[PDB]
Write a protein that binds this ligand. Structure first.
Ligand SMILES: COc1cc(C(=O)NC2CCN(C)CC2)ccc1Nc1ncc2c(n1)N(C1CCCC1)CC(F)(F)C(=O)N2C
Length: 108
């Protein structure tokens, strides 16, 4: 849980506080957003709120599962959209800030 503790108390908390994380704090509502074939293209939707709940509920056994959830959220966004898009620019800056806090996680 030590790494998992750091993911929840440091990484998630820091990522959520960035103003441009707002698109990622809730699951993508493909209908209200009028997104065609979102659910056909993205078969594992993921978002920060779900990661929060999973960490609150100790859904994760190992830190690695949680890291994969962060990455899935990013890579879903990179796959469905195009380079240069606003939403991609936001994900890219969020991931850079993710990688930085993750690089200071307790070792081992
Ligand atoms: C909160 O509701 C929204 C409202 C508005 C909204 O109403 N914006 C207007 C209001 C203010 N003006 C100024 C600009 C338009 C825009 C987006 C919203 N939400 C959202 N959340 C997440 C995604 C997303 N959108 N996407 C965006 C990119 C292109 C249009 C959807 C693409 C995506 F594929 F779903 C994706 O990967 N993500 C992560």
């Amino acid at each position: 849980t030590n790494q998992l503790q750091y993911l929840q108390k440091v990484v998630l908390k820091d990522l959520w506080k960035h103003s441009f994380s707002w698109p990622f704090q809730r699951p993508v509502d493909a209908v209200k957003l009028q997104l065609p074939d979102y659910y056909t293209i993205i078969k594992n939707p993921m978002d920060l709120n779900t990661i929060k709940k999973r960490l609150e509920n100790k859904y994760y056994a190992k830190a690695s599962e949680c890291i994969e959830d962060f990455n899935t959220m990013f890579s879903n966004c990179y796959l469905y959209n195009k380079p240069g898009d606003d939403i991609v620019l936001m994900a890219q800056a969020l991931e850079k800030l993710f990688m930085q806090k993750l690089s200071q996680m307790p070792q081992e």
